[PDB]
Amino acid sequence: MQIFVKTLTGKTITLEVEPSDTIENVKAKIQDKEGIPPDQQRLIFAGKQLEDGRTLSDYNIQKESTLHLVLRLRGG
Amino acid sequence: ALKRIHKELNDLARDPPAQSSAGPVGDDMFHWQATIMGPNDSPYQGGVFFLTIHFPTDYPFKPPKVAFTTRIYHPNINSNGSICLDILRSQWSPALTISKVLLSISSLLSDPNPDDPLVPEIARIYKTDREKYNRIAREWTQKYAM
Amino acid sequence: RAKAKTRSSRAGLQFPVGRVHRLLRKGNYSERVGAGAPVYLAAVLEYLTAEILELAGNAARDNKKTRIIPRHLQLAIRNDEELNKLLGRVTIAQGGVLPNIQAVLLPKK
Amino acid sequence: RAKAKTRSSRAGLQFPVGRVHRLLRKGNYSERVGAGAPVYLAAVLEYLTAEILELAGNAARDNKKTRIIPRHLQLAIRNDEELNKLLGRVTIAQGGVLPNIQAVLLPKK
Amino acid sequence: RSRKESYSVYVYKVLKQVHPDTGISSKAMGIMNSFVNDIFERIAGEASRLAHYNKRSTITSREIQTAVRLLLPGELAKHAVSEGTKAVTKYTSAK
Amino acid sequence: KRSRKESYSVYVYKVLKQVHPDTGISSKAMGIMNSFVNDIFERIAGEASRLAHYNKRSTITSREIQTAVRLLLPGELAKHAVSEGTKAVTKYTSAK
Amino acid sequence: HRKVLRDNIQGITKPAIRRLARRGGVKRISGLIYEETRGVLKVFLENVIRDAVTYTEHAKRKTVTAMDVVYALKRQGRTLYGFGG
Amino acid sequence: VLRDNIQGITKPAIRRLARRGGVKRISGLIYEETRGVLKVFLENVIRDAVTYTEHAKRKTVTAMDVVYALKRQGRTLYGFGG
Amino acid sequence: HRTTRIKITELNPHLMCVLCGGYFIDATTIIECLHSFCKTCIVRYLETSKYCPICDVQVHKTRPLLNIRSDKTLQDIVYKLVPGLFKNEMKRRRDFYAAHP
Amino acid sequence: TWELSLYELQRTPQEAITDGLEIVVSPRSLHSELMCPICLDMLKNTMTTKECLHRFCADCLITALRSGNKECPTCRKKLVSKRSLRPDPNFDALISKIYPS
Amino acid sequence: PHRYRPGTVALREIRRYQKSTELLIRKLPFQRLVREIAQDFKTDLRFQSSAVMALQEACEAYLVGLFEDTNLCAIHAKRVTIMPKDIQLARRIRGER
Amino acid sequence: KPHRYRPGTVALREIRRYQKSTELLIRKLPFQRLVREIAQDFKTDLRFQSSAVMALQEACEAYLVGLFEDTNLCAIHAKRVTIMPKDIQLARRIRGER
DNA sequence: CGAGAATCCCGGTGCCGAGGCCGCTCAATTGGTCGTAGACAGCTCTAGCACCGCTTAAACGCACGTACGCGCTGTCCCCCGCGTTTTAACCGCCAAGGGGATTACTCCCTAGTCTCCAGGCACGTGTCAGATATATACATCCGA
DNA sequence: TCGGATGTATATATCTGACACGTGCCTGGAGACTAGGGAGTAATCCCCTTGGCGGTTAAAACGCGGGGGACAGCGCGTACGTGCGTTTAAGCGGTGCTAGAGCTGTCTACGACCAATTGAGCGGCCTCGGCACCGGGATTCTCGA
Ligand SMILES: [Zn+2]
Ligand SMILES: [Zn+2]
Ligand SMILES: [Zn+2]
Ligand SMILES: [Zn+2]
């Protein structure tokens, strides 16, 4: 479903992600839309981050929810 | 650098961010203090860590100085307290608020960036071992923070 | 007569259409100069000096000054990518250099 | 009349003083052109083509040929230090490159 | 004796529109005079070549649009073409 | 009607037959020699026009083409072209 | 009656870039060069074809002639010899 | 006749010109190199600037003759005329 | 303010197209002139011309689709100020695919 | 790409609402749209980017460009100067009609 | 069965193309570059045949001019292989980037 | 036991000092002696306007600062910190001067 | 120190482009007049050169120690060379038609001239922005 | 991991000279008019640009192996940085001289402009010799040993 994606500075993305999909599949869809690699991405729900092996159905993530993106710049 | 700070306090009192809090020390609207509640996926359970936030008086067009007052063993964090982020150092924008900075600090405690450390001898055993710092981060945070 | 107005007020400009027309005549560019040709130059020359004095006047307020100094002209020009392409083979006298230290030279953490 | 001779034979030249004079008139350089001005250009333009066709014709004899090819024009020009200073921002079509391999790339002894 | 023409009167008139409270020192008015003088010779220099290339003896506003499009980079050229044509169409109406 | 395009092709053959009377030039290298001559009009008459504007004069004379040659041509190209340009002008004070 | 011409930069093949490097006198060529010299040909060609088309837009022609390329390159300080002018 | 004035461009003056360039460390063989580069630069600009005074039949070298000699070499100054 | 209630009658022409005369749905703006229309308005209209239908500023020299970018923030003003278009767009869309699988 | 699919090619304009209907606007709903993300206040003299279509104040972008790096501060894209921005007067009248004065 | 050392055929190819004056880039896939890039400036542009050949001889002459300047960047970094670091110095000292 | 900065910190302090200021960095009297040596090879008993020598200081120092910005890039490319006379010759050749 | 691709050298065929010839128009030459650009001479006075004395900023010389340039070693990735298979460039041919040249006609636009007057330049004057000095408080570097 | 030392930004008062404004005067721009030709327009020719087949085969693409070169680490040593103390001469400011820049005025020789004339140089046509290509055999690096 349409889940909005917030960033730190304010990019908003319309993702069509089913709740059956895993969290790594959510990362791989931001590959094809903005070029961002998944190995830099963080994803936060109200204090709790997302593990890689889980899905979006564990946290009761309903329709029209918000993500958060924090970029892990490997080297600075 | 005076009127936008009044509305950040509206942005922190109406909806305070998770595992976070902030506010001024006193009459000075350029020296702030903040706390961090430790996350549960991290080896930082039983969190509280204090902060100091200094405004360069051309805010929001110069990155603020945020340092640690409590000692934290973590590869991208000095023994003096300065945080090694690419946000507050190089890649910064005037559209970032402190409430977005605190969520970028809270996410350092779960997973760091082990490719550019500050004390480089700490980040060596992260790259080879995993069972050591799971205990070290639980010993040195129950003493100097709890 | 009918109270001579100017050409540059008929164009809504401030750069002189009368001087530009006789600097195109005297100056050996062509045999003839069209009537709308100094109106076009005087409009382009306004809105290239207006676009520098915007940016130079903003750089004077950052240094808390009320006069434009030739420091502020290079801070205006060498911070645009498009005023650097006009003025890349141009040295501004007493303008200085943009402060740029490269990251290899800075001390290690 | 008196049997029109030319101007370029009065100057002892072969480049045309008559064309140079009307390319200085038609061409918008000045209002007036002096009488000794096309005589001076036609003499300078001879003895810059004569100094290239010396060196290009010598490079044609080294390749055992009797026609000047645009290979021989770059072998003439890029081997002078002074024809390189005129023609340093000039590419000659089908002229190629001087053969220069640098000594670091050659195999060790 | 021997009065000398410059563009200094018109740079102050463009200041008082843009920043009505700032001024310019005399060493930077001498630099703004040489911006204007050395962009005549760029624009009128290439507008004269375009008349010779096309075998014409007039420099019109059609040949100053393209000298601007050749010389000015990117969006300097877009805003100076648009504000050079707004002066010609305002000139030819008020005659 | 073909407009009778002018070039300097007749005058580059006449300078060959002085210099190398047994060689020729292909047509693709004549178009390059026609481009040397046209692009050195533009340099010399370009700077001779500026020397008249800088000094507030309306004539290009042989004085303004000496100093345009001295500005443009490097080193010993300038010395041999100034001397061989004044030898052609002084074949008018004796030959008018 | 164009549709679109699609890619055509991959037609600057890797053996064609190795030939151009060996007039430069190059022995060894890393594999990341071929992706970048295609991007430098874009910037050479886009700058010249901007100027060469604005010489034809205003001569009111529809063909880009050989002189319009010569004047576009002379305007950038890279003069061609052997095509007129 | 003046002699030996290239050495009046001292060692600490070149280190100031290097530190608008942004140079931390400077090897000791550079000061003889950069004096030889100012020779070649000034000999090219003064040669053209004098031939503008020679053409104008004038015995002083004015400020515009330097500006026209620099504009000819592709280095235009703003601030001294033009 | 705190409420600042308003009528639709003063909020019509900032939510109306010209090529259809209706509310913005998938609104795209021209980069040059910043006049907004629907996606099914401009993409049809710039198959024929190279000019904005409001102010006749040329969109692009050859292909006017390059200087068209969709404005997400102007849609979100249209869905919020008008009662029930995010449903009524989907209800018109879901009833379309009910006959065309 | 700007290829229309099947529903885009066979859709109808949704008409206006001309009957007088009050809109209960709430200021807890229009935060990310009418507010400048630099000064955290209402948008005034709005300048939108070309490539990104993000709205700021006029005196906030020009200060953010010369006192920082040359990017859109909410996209990290490439800005060059103030002339890669366009003022939107069709957005300024949304604030002056919803929130006067 | 028979192999040259790596670097000896490379020195042969430097001597082949520094003698020849032919166009090293092809001719049909480079009318297609010229006609893609010109799609953004006018529609339905024709080209003279000598207008595309003036563009190949300009583009080859200034890529060969680059690789002469990226040797010097590779050799002064004490290398033999050119890296894309070397194109970036050569285009920055020239004033292009 | 007396105060002593590490080598490199005063040098970075001077880079920030001179990239902030706009004055001329060569002394003005020994620069006039150059200009009047070099011009002796072209005419004798030449005079100079006072702004003709100052036009040559603005042009020469902008030329040398522009070189040292390019010899940094040639020293950092070779993984060094010192500029060297290798680096002047390499920047001056790619420009088209040697 | 021989084997094997590769580079040169030579003698022969074959074609097409250079070089010469010719008819002819248009551009250069002759001869002449006319107004003005520039050469020349005199004179005013600005500014460039020369000298002096004093203050003190900056260049110079020296010593010491750190840290960076540079040579050496080893490991491994990644280019080169080569052989095989596949793509499409190249060539020649044919055909249609857009559009580049060219002409002829006509009219609007620009130069040129005369007059009139106001915009811009030189010159003068007074006030405030900026520079300098002082005295702070705070930031930053570094040995212990 | 820290306190002393040095350097930095920051605030305040004083002071000078350069900016900005004003005034008077003159010369350059505007208004009005006329005349001639440059350019816009229409019609027409025919060149040359595109487009499409088809056969051939040079050149790209792919894959494999192995050696050379990039790159990181390490140790040594010397050359550059920092700094103190002493020497030099730049900088200022002042006075005095005169060369030469800059202007004015008079006058002539030079160049534009014109009309008539005629021969140089362009375009088209024709042809033979330079140069490319083929092919056979000398022969010169290259590399394993
Ligand atoms: Zn619509
Ligand atoms: Zn529009
Ligand atoms: Zn954006
Ligand atoms: Zn704002």
Contact between the CB of C3 and strand M at under 7 Å = yes
Minimal CA–CA distance to G85: which of F39, I88, B33, L9? F39
C107: left (phi over 0), alpha (psi -120 to 50) or beta: beta
* Residue recorded with tokens 């006198």: G25
Other Cβ atoms less than 10 A from the Cβ of B71: the count is 17
Q: Counting beta carbons within 10 angstroms of the beta carbon of residue G13, is it exposed (0 to 12), middle (13 to 18) or buried (19 or more)?
A: middle
How far, in Å, are A65, E45, F59, F79, I16 from residue C49 at the CA level?
Answer: 50, 19, 34, 44, 39
In angstroms, the CA I89 to CA I86 distance is 5
Q: Which CA distances in Å does A29 have to A18, C16, H41?
A: 12, 59, 58
Going by C-beta distance under 8 Å and a sequence separation of 6 or more, which residues neighbour residue L13? Answer: none
Domains: count for chain H? 1
- Burial class, C107, CB count within 10 angstroms (exposed 0-12 / middle 13-18 / buried 19+): exposed
Do C and E have ≥3 inter-chain CB pairs under 8 A?
yes
Domain residues of chain L, as ranges? 9-95
| J16 in I contact zone (CB under 8 Å) | yes
- Report the candidate in L70, L63, L61 with the shortest Cα–Cα distance to residue L94: L70
Tokens of E5: 């023409």
Q: Which domain holds residue G41?
A: 3-84
Q: CA torsion I93→I94→I95→I98, rounded to 10°?
A: 130
What CATH code is carried by the domain that includes residue G19? 1.10.20.10
Chains G and F touch (3+ CB pairs under 8 A): yes
**Domain K8-94, CATH among 3.10.450.50, 1.10.3210.10, 1.10.20.10, 1.10.150.20:** 1.10.20.10
C51 and J70: CB-CB below 8 Å? no
DSSP string, H28-78: TTHHHHHHHHHHHHHHHHHHHHHHHHHHTT-SEE-HHHHHHHHHHTT-EEE
- Residue J33 CA to ligand 4 center (angstroms) comes to 13
CA of D102 vs chain F CAs: smallest distance (Å): 28
Strands (DSSP E) found in B6-142: 20-24, 31-36, 49-54, 65-68
As a whole number of angstroms, the distance between CA B20 and CA A47 comes to 9
Name the residue among J98, A61, D45 with its Cα closest to residue I14: J98
- Nearest in space to K92 (alpha carbons), one of C101, C88, G46: C88
Ligand nearest the Cα atom of residue I17:
1
Q: Is A27 helix (H, G, I), strand (E, B) or coil?
A: helix
Note the CA–C1' distance, J50 to M30, in angstroms.
69
Round to whole Å and give the CA distance between K13 and G71.
Answer: 34
- Provide the Cα torsion G2, G3, G4, G10; round to 10°: -90
Residue with tokens 């052609």: F88
Residue J12 Cα to ligand 1 midpoint, Å, equals: 9
DSSP symbol at B77? B
Q: Cα dihedral angle (K65, K71, K76, K81), rounded to 10 degrees? A: 150
Instruction: Using CA atoms of K13, K16, K18, K22 in order, give the dihedral in degrees to the nearest 10.
Output: -110
Closest-CA distance of chain H to residue E42, Å:
13
Cβ-count burial of I99 within 10 angstroms (0-12 exposed, 13-18 middle, 19+ buried)?
exposed
Cβ under 8 Å to D: F residues 67-96: 69, 72-77, 80-81, 84-89, 91-92, 95-96
D15 touches strand M (CB under 7 A): no
Instruction: Look at residue E51 and tell me if it is in a domain.
Output: yes
Question: Mind telling me how many Å the CA of E20 is from chain G's nearest CA?
Answer: 39
- DSSP assignment of C29-73 equals S-SEE-TTHHHHHHHHHHHHHHHHHHHHHHHHHHTT-SEE-HHHH
Ligand nearest, relative to CA of residue I30: 2
The CA J72 to ligand 3 mean position distance, Å, reads 5
Locate B105 and state its tokens: 């600090």
Helix (H, G, I), strand (E, B) or coil at J99: coil
Topology, domain A2-71: Ubiquitin-like (UB roll) (3.10.20)
Contact at 8 Å (CB) between B127 and B133? no
**With an 8 Å Cβ cutoff, are I5 and J50 in contact?**
no
Domains recognised in chain D with CATH numbers: 17-86 (1.10.20.10)
Q: Is residue F85 part of a domain?
A: yes
Q: A29 near A13, Cβ under 8 Å?
A: no
A70-71 and H25-26 strand pairing: unpaired
Max CA-CA distance within chain B?
49
Token pair for residue L27? 């002394």
Of all ligands present, the nearest one to the C-alpha of I69 is 3
Around Cβ D66, how many Cβ atoms within 10 Å?
A: 11
Burial class (CB in 10 A: 0-12, 13-18, 19+), A41: buried
Residues 6+ apart with CB under 8 A from H67: H76, H77, H80, H81, H82, L55
CA-based nearest residue in chain K for residue D74: K21
Please indicate, yes or no, if residue H66 is contained in any of the structural domains: yes
SS3 C77: helix
Interface of C with D (CB under 8 A): 28-31
Chain F touches chain K, with at least 3 Cβ pairs below 8 Å, answer no
Query: Which CATH number fits the domain that encloses residue F74?
Result: 1.10.20.10
Distance from residue L9's CA to nucleotide N71's C1', rounded to whole Å: 29
- Number of Cβ atoms within 10 Å of the Cβ of J62: 18
Q: What whole-number distance in Å separates Cα of residue L48 and Cα of residue L34?
A: 12
Protein residues with C-beta less than 5 angstroms from the ion ligand 2: I 33, 35, 52, 54-55
Domain residue ranges in chain A: 2-71
Residues of B belonging to the active site: 84
**What are the phi and psi torsion angles at K14 (to 5°)?**
-70, -35
Report the distance separating Cα H70 and Cα H45, nearest Å.
Answer: 6
Nucleotide at minimal C1' distance from the C14 CA: M119
Return the structure tokens found at C35: 């009537």
What type of residue sits at position J15? E
Residue A16 has phi, psi (to 5 degrees) of: -100, 80
Chain D positions touching F29 (Cβ under 8 A) are 56, 68-70, 72-73
Number of independent structural domains in chain E: 1
The DSSP output letter for B21 is E
Domain containing residue B114: CATH number:
3.10.110.10
Beta bridge partners of B20: B36
Tokens linked to I24: 């913005």
Dist. CA I69 → ligand 4 center (Å): 23
- Is E76 a member of any domain? yes
Tokens of E57: 């003896």
| Nearest Cα residue to C37 out of E54, G71, E43 | E43
Question: Pairing relation of β-strands J85-87 and G63-64?
Answer: unpaired
DSSP state letters, I59-96: --SS-TTTTEEE-HHHHHHHHHHSTTSHHHHHHHHHHH
Amino acid present at F55: N
Architecture of the domain delimited by L9-95 = Orthogonal Bundle (1.10)
Q: State the distance from the centre of ligand 4 to the C-alpha of B4, rounded, in angstroms.
A: 9
SS3 state of residue L13: helix
**CA-CA distance, J92 to J94, in Å (whole number)?**
5
For residue G50, what is the nearest residue in chain E, using CA coordinates? Answer: E70
DSSP E strands: which ranges in G1-85? 28-29, 63-64, 79-81
How many CB atoms are located within 10 Å of the residue J49 CB? 21
Q: Give the separation between CA D76 and CA D97, rounded to whole angstroms.
A: 12
In chain J, DSSP assigns E strands to 22-23, 46-49, 55-57, 85-87
Handedness of CA E82, E88, E92, E93 (dihedral sign): positive
Q: What CA–CA distance (Å, rounded) separates G67 from G56?
A: 10
K80: three-class secondary structure by DSSP? coil
Domain of E45, in residue numbers: 7-93
Report the distance separating Cα A39 and Cα A27, nearest Å.
Answer: 9
Residue E93 touches chain G, beta carbons under 8 Å:
no
Q: For chain B, which chains pass the contact test of at least 3 CB pairs under 8 Å?
A: A, C, J
Look at the alpha carbons of C55, C57, C60, C62 in this order and tell me if their dihedral is positive or negative.
negative
The radius of gyration of chain H's CA atoms, rounded to the nearest angstrom, is 16
Residue owning tokens 């002593």: L4
Q: Report the residue numbers after which chain D has a gap, meaning the C atom sits over 2.5 angstroms from the next written residue's N, or none.
A: none
Asked if G85 lies within 8 A of F39 by C-beta distance, the reply is yes
* Residues of chain E positioned with their CB less than 8 A from the CB of H78: 30-31, 34-35, 38
